[PDB]
Amino acid sequence: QRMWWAFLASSMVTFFGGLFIILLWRTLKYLWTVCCVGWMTSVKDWAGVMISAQTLTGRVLVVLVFALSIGALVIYFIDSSNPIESCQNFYKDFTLQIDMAFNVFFLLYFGLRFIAANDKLWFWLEVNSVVDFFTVPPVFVSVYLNRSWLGLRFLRALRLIQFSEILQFLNILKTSNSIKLVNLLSIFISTWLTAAGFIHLVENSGDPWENFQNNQALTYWECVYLLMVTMSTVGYGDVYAKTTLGRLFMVFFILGGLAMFASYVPEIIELIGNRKKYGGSYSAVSGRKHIVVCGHIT
Amino acid sequence: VFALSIGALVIYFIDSSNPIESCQNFYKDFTLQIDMAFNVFFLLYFGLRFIAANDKLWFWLEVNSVVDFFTVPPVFVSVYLNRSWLGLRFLRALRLIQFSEILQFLNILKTSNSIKLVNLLSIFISTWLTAAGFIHLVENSGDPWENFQNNQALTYWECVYLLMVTMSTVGYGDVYAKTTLGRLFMVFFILGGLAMFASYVPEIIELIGNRKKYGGSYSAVSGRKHIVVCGHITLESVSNFLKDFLHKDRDDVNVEIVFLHNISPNLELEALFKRHFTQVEFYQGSVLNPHDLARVKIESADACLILANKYCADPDAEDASNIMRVISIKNYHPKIRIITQMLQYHNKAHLLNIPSWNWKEGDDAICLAELKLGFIAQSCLAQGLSTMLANLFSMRSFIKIEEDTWQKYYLEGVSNEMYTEYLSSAFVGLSFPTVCELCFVKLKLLMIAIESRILINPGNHL
Amino acid sequence: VNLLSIFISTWLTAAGFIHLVENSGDPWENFQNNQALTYWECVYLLMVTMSTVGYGDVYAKTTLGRLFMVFFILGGLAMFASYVPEIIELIGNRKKYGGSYSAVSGRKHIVVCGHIT
Amino acid sequence: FIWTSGRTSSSYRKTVTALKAGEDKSIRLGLFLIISGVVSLFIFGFCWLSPALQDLQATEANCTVLSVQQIGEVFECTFTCGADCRGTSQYPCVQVYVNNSESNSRALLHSDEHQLLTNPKCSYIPPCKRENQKNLESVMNWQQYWKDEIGSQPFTCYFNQHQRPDDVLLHRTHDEIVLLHCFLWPLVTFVVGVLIVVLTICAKSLAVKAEAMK
Amino acid sequence: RKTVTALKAGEDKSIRLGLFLIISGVVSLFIFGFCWLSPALQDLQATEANCTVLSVQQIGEVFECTFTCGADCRGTSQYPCVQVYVNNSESNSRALLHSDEHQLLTNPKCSYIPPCKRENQKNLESVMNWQQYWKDEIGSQPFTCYFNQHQRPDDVLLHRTHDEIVLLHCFLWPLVTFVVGVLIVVLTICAKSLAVKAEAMK
Ligand SMILES: CC(C)CCC[C@@H](C)[C@H]1CC[C@H]2[C@@H]3CC=C4C[C@@H](O)CC[C@]4(C)[C@H]3CC[C@]12C
Ligand SMILES: CC(C)CCC[C@@H](C)[C@H]1CC[C@H]2[C@@H]3CC=C4C[C@@H](O)CC[C@]4(C)[C@H]3CC[C@]12C
Ligand SMILES: CC(C)CCC[C@@H](C)[C@H]1CC[C@H]2[C@@H]3CC=C4C[C@@H](O)CC[C@]4(C)[C@H]3CC[C@]12C
Ligand SMILES: [Ca+2]
Ligand SMILES: [K+]
Ligand SMILES: [K+]
Ligand SMILES: [K+]
Ligand SMILES: [K+]
Ligand SMILES: [Mg+2]
């Protein structure tokens, strides 16, 4: 028996049940009018300070988030080399225990950002909330079931979008050029890796109307290379999508990914290399005089 | 018309999965009856547009007339013959060109950006689908000089994918045209379709995503006061203001700061607001707009601060702009405390004639020229007094270094500011000199004055 | 007219040269690696190469053919990228609001001019 | 790079508070789910159309075997061994001919449509298990179990006089469950999208009534 | 001069169309002419002849035909090879008979191919049927045949592979496009110039 749907159901149920609970609470709050500084604000302020880097504990938490995002991405990269669905012992799988701990920390960081949030519904629809709903619940389900599906785990790469924000929190990024460069690099890499993971999932699991018989055995790095070739418009043709869903995804990505590549790669290359050629200072020579000339130089 | 165009396109999409020519019973084919009715409606809509036309010959040569001549008669022939050919039925996709026009008729599309976006999307999609249908027809029916033997069995969606790959210039080579007519069509499409793709896809992506990041409005918090700041907002102006407002030498104030400005903040201002994430909020709007003033909740703000551009090219223009801002804020809410910077003194006199301008309630016009010339005059009574006064306002921490230099002593002196607070009943009934010599080093506090209200250095008789 | 003439003549001449070079093989290979390519096939290959589509169904295989392909990729893509947009801009410069009003018997009409916005 | 240097780069009431922005984002989401559900329904509908008609056009029948025999010829199956390891092994060909309910004439039995399409010249294929001896043993085992089935029990069979004109199948190759899920979950997406819009408008309009009440 | 009303714009669009049809017809004539050139010369260069069979025999070797079964289903079946040799009107020497140019090109080693009908037995039966009908045709009636000493140097055909009707339609309808384009220009100029005379008459 296969269990792929249990992981996916846990994410869908989490995202939409939370959204419906929030909307029902709103509805019923106003409906009570038909029948008819606080500690809440103090904990909201404390959570907002923790979320920012205004304290030592907040800085430690932000650095931990930065490290654990890369850790989870590396864990997904390790798992991407295995079969699509498998049975594996939680008590004897160090990577599953490490993932379990990482997702505990992300659940806690999610809880802190929820408490700190001003508009809950606005928070529930912030995309790094969506990234947590589509990546945290399936880890819990896997650790409970003693089984894993390599399903939507490529969405972990979207965690790189917050890197510039948490670098600005840590008082590291100050200049506009550096901020823009980090933003562009993060968006480019996360988009590339996420799209590669999705096309990897879709190619390795065939079309349902073809009874999953036309699947193509493509590795994650092969899909990454194919996406790079497609984005740059080189189009070698050695590697390409063959399933109907894969090609349907390829068509929608060709509209967005080429505009991203054509826009971001020149701008990144302009932002880098902005070095001053004439820097440094003169070194005096003993026994030889020197003359400084300034004013109208042409 | 809008619905039936999509209906006919969907009918063509269904038929594109069948053989190229076939016999099918009109009395037992629901899709052929539905197509029959759809084409009756298009014949009627054609007749109405013909009657409404001014120049008939101009109408006969309008391309949606041509699209009807190439799509309506063959449906009639098919319904008469009890047979169908998947011939020029892909021209149905050209019906999407009129979508923007009939949306403008229905008073739905009004803005230029939305009209342009709809036009570009319609032209792109209709061109793509029509070209895909034509290459599908040409590939599935081979070359006449090769006796139709070199035909390639390509599905319509396969041809759509091939056209997308060709337009974007990716050119995988997994799917390509093989017939001579198919390649001849490919060569002419490569000239036009790449120029369309290269032009339209960036422009569509620019038209979408034009969202305002700083929208919304401030949400007041019970038990906590907030302050609205407007006027000259820039990275250095906000950075200097926040250093003095949020300094650790004040007591534990939790006044929120809300900025209102009509320019989107640059990346360095957004980073400055992120470094103050729990104490500063920014909202993009105009102080002259009552909607924006309601957005920043200025009716419940504790005060409104209006910073001025001290280095402006036209002091008169800057004063006029600040006067207009004050007028707008007072007009929205007469009972709002307003603190503003005024470059000149005659413009300050102009401003204080406002009916809602109440200096007793706390309206302060900080006149820069007046205060600076007064400070210069006090330096003429005692040299160094301008420095003495200026350092009493700026919030400064103690700074200490091991070097024995004049700077150490100077910084130790600079560490003090002027404050104001109520004093103990244990000092009521004594003389002002007596409480001064008491406070001086026992409490470590120096008094310049007390609240016949404001009295500068009282005598021994008070 | 200048752009169209230069584009077409360059395209056809380059296609003929690559057709000659592909159909007569390499002298160091003793003319044994020749590829039987028709002139129209070479024209299609040149169009595919110029537009940067690069299907790969048809391509040069001889050493001289590839050496010619490398030098043409430098010039022909810059020509295509420059000329095709400029030609497409030059065409289609039609005035949408031309023509003249046609009076209707029994109905009056009013002409409005000046500051129209 | 699409365009070399961008084609030479010379040729290319407001009483509601902050909650308004979260609610307008909730409308957006609910609308996007409505569009997604409808679009995916059409996409899956075009993909399932030919398989579903090729399945529907095949009628159920009652069958009985006329004969079981070998044609003496042999064919390659592929056998597998981890990573990518494969080789080929022979199997002997059986043919089986069967009584038919629509044409009442000879047709050749094919266990399923994948067997028909992988070797239309032959009636059965063994799962390739290394050596030729095990393939022949497994064909002889299936052959003996089919040869004595003479009118024992008219087993049901699937036929299509328009595209399997003298070929017969023992199974449907179209899983009803997989099709059901392909049309159910896009419908669920659409219903969820409607409920999100409805609750967002219900909350938005009740906020105005609860404001005017004060 | 601009006495004509709005009708001027419809008539200038009608001139455009008529000119575009003239250009289309001429361009398509050249395009079809280049595509038909090699097939038409390869057909013209093959002369009509009178033939008689020298012998009918099998070479003992067998070949694959492909047999088909809906969607994409195909497999292969053997057929036995006949060869047939024939008297010739241009070279007066041995040549091998090939029923048509597609048979010559699909298997130039062999004289006939059966339409693949599933099993080998039906292919062999259909070859034996054709073989027996050809073996007794000895001088019975000098059947006409097609030959080309320059590109079918010892090969002979029973049929022309070039349909005259398909070529006729490929050159007729571009000519019709051109004639219609001329008549549209002519009637548009005739209407435009008579409108000026009917205006000056008032
Ligand atoms: C508290 C909320 C967020 C939990 C999220 C819902 C998830 C966890 C729910 C939804 C459907 C549930 C699954 C439904 C069916 C099975 C199969 C059974 O053999 C073990 C339990 C298991 C595997 C359930 C595990 C929990 C589950 C996956
Ligand atoms: C975590 C998921 C599953 C449940 C979400 C909890 C929901 C039902 C509850 C818990 C606390 C509630 C929030 C408490 C405070 C506010 C601030 C007010 O100005 C708007 C409503 C809002 C935002 C409430 C909305 C509903 C709410 C978010
Ligand atoms: C539908 C096809 C078959 C026939 C079209 C009808 C023909 C015969 C007739 C009917 C109505 C006529 C039009 C009626 C009115 C005008 C306006 C006038 O100032 C010039 C002639 C013009 C433009 C006529 C042209 C010819 C015309 C279009
Ligand atoms: Ca101090
Ligand atoms: K390219
Ligand atoms: K390419
Ligand atoms: K390519
Ligand atoms: K290629
Ligand atoms: Mg706040």
Q: Whose CA is nearest to atom 14 of ligand 2?
A: A120
N-term to C-term CA, chain A: 81
Which residue among B198, B202, B216 sits closest to D21, beta carbon to beta carbon?
B216
* Helix H or strand E segment including C76: helix C63-90
For atom 5 of ligand 2, the residue with the nearest CA is: A22
For residue A17, the ligand 2 atom closest to its alpha carbon is 3
Q: Which residue's CA is the closest to the ligand 3 atom numbered 5?
A: B56
Residue B98: name the closest of B24, B195, B177, B6 by CA. Answer: B6
Residue located nearest, by CA, to atom 2 of ligand 2? A18
First to last CA, chain D: 60
Distances in whole angstroms, Cα of residue D168 to Cα of each of A209, D146, D160, D210: 22, 15, 8, 70
Q: How far apart are CA D132 and CA B275, in angstroms?
A: 75
What phi, psi does D174 have (nearest 5°)?
Answer: -110, 105
Give the mutation target among B43, B51, B56 for probing the ligand 3 site: most ligand atoms within 8 A of CB: B56
Residues B16 and B86: their CA atoms lie apart, in Å, by: 7
For ligand 2, residues with CB inside 6 Å are A 18, 21-22, 25-26, 120
> Which of E5, E12, E27, E37 to probe the C interface (max C CBs under 10 A)?
E5
Single-letter amino acid, residue E13: K
Using CA atoms, how far apart are residues E72 and D76, in angstroms rounded to an integer?
20
Q: What is the rounded distance in angstroms from the CA atom of residue A242 to the CA atom of residue A233?
A: 18
Ligand 1 atom closest to residue A9's alpha carbon, by position in its atom list: 10
Of the candidates C77, C78, C85, the beta carbon closest to that of D11 is on C85
Q: Rounded to 5 degrees, what are φ and ψ at E147? A: -145, 155
Atom 15 (ligand 1): residue with closest C-alpha?
A: A6
How far is Cα B71 from Cα C64, in angstroms, rounded to an integer?
Answer: 51
d(CA D119, CA D91): 12
Pocket test for ligand 2, best of A44, A119, A120 (most atoms within 8 A of CB): A120
Of B157, B199, B291, the CB nearest to D14: B291
With an 8 Å Cβ cutoff, are E9 and B143 in contact?
no
CB E70 to CB D163 under 8 A? Answer: yes
Length of chain C: 117
Q: C28 CA to middle of ligand 8, Å?
A: 29
Q: Do C56 and A237 touch (CB under 8 A)?
A: yes
Q: Which two tokens stand for residue C61?
A: 């295989």
Judge C/E contact: 3 or more CB pairs < 8 A.
yes
Chain B, residues 236-255, CB within 8 A of chain A, namely 254
Q: Which residues of A touch B217 (CB under 8 A)?
A: none
Q: Dihedral of the CA atoms B347, B352, B353, B354 (nearest 10)?
A: 110
Elucidation method? cryo-EM
Pairs of CB atoms within 8 A across C/D:
12
Using alpha carbons only, give the angle B234, B237, B239 rounded to the nearest 5 degrees.
100
Cα–Cα distance, A107 to A13 (Å, whole number): 16
- Testing ligand 1's pocket by substitution, the residue of A8, A10, A19 carrying the most ligand atoms inside 8 A of its CB is A10
CA of A6 to the centre of ligand 1 (A): 6
Chains A and E touch (3+ CB pairs under 8 A): no
The full DSSP string for chain A is ---HHHHHHHHHHHHHHHHHHHHHHHHHHHHHHHH---HHHHHHHHHHHHHTTSSHHHHHHHHHHHHHHHHHHHHHHHHTTS-SEEE--GGG-HHHHHHHHHHHHHHHHHHHHHHH-SSHHHHHTSHHHHHHHTTSHHHHHHHHHTEEE-SSGGGGGGGGGGHHHHHHHTT---SHHHHHHHHHHHHHHHHHHHHHHHHHHHHHS--TTTTT-S-----HHHHHHHHHHHHTT---SSS---SHHHHHHHHHHHHHHHHHHHHHHHHHHHHTT---TT-S-----TT-------SS--
Most C CBs within 10 Å, among B59, B119, B169, B194, to test the C interface: B194
Indicate the burial class of E201 (C-beta count within 10 angstroms; 0-12, 13-18, 19 or more).
exposed
Instruction: Give the whole-angstrom CA distance, residue B201 versus residue E165.
Output: 46
User: Which atom of ligand 1 lies nearest, measured to the CA of A3?
Assistant: 23
Longest dimension (CA), chain D: 94
Q: Say if strands B449-450 and B455-456 run parallel, antiparallel, or are unpaired.
A: antiparallel
To the question of whether residue B281 is assigned a binding role by annotation, the answer is yes
CA dist list (Å): D114 to A283, D133, E73, E178? 83, 24, 10, 54
Q: A-C interface: how many C-beta pairs under 8 angstroms?
A: 5
In angstroms, the CA B124 to CA B109 distance is: 19
Beta bridge partners of E147: E47
Close Cβ partners of D154 (under 8 Å, ≥ 6 residues apart): D62, D63, D64
Q: Does residue B54's CB lie within 6 angstroms of at least one atom of ligand 3?
A: no
SS (H, E, C) E169-199: HHHHHHHHHHHHHHHHHHHHHHHHHHHHHHH
Measure the CA dihedral D185/D187/D191/D193, to 10°.
70
Which DSSP state fits B360? T
**Nearby residues for ligand 7 (ion, Cβ within 5 Å):** A 235; B 171; C 54
CA distances from A66 to A54, A74, A159 (A): 16, 13, 9
Q: How far is CA B417 from the centre of its chain?
A: 42
State how far the Cα of C80 lies from the Cα of A248, in Å rounded to an integer: 30
Q: Which two tokens stand for residue A45?
A: 């302020």
Backbone angles phi, psi at A274, to 5 degrees: -85, 70
Angle at B257 between CA B254 and CA B260, to 5 degrees: 165
Query: Is residue B196 helix, strand or coil?
Result: helix
Q: What span, in angstroms and rounded, lies between the C-alpha atoms of D143 and D126?
A: 11
Cβ-defined contact of D18 to B215 (cutoff 8 Å):
no
Q: Give the type of residue at A132.
A: D
d(CA C73, nearest CA chain E) in Å = 28
According to DSSP, the residues that pair with D109 across neighbouring strands are D168
Helix (H) or strand (E) run with residue E104 in it: helix E101-106
The rounded radius of gyration (Å) of the Cα atoms in chain C is 25
| Rounded (10°) angle between helices B73-81 and B30-52 | 140
The token duo for A9 is 């159901």
The Cα A126–Cα A18 span in angstroms is 13
Cα(D128)–Cα(D80) distance, rounded to whole angstroms? 8
Please say whether the beta carbons of D138 and D129 come within 8 A: yes
Contacts of C81 in chain D (CB under 8 A): 3-4, 7-8
d(CA A208, CA D52): 12
Q: Whose CA is nearest to atom 24 of ligand 3?
A: B56
What residue owns the CA closest to ligand 3's atom 1? B50
Six token digits for residue B378: 């006090």
- Work out the burial of residue D101: count CB atoms within 10 Å of its CB; fewer than 13 is exposed, 13-18 middle, 19 or more buried: middle
Atom of ligand 3 nearest to the CA of E6: 19
Are residues D209 and A33, on separate chains, in Cβ contact within 8 Å? Answer: yes
Q: What is the phi-psi region of residue A211: left when phi exceeds 0, alpha when psi lies from -120 to 50, beta otherwise?
A: left
**What is the enclosing helix (H) or strand (E) of B107?**
none
Query: CB distance B54–C102 less than 8 Å?
Result: yes
D14 lies within 8 A of chain B by CB: yes
Rg, chain A, Cα only: 25
Tell me which chain E residues have a C-beta less than 8 angstroms from the C-beta of B57: 7, 10-11, 13-14
Which residue's CA is the nearest one to ligand 1's atom 16?
Answer: A6
Contact call for C86 and D4, based on CB within 8 A: no
Closest CA to D2 of A70, B200, A287, B365: B200
Chain D meets chain C (3+ C-beta pairs below 8 A):
yes
CA–CA separation, B170 and B183 (whole Å): 17
Question: Chain C interface, mutation test: which of B62, B101, B176, most C Cβ atoms within 10 Å?
Answer: B176
Task: Name the closest residue on chain A to residue B225, using Cα atoms.
Answer: A37
Q: Which of B55, B61, B145 sits opposite E6 (nearest CB)?
A: B55
Neighbours of E70 (CB within 10 A): 16
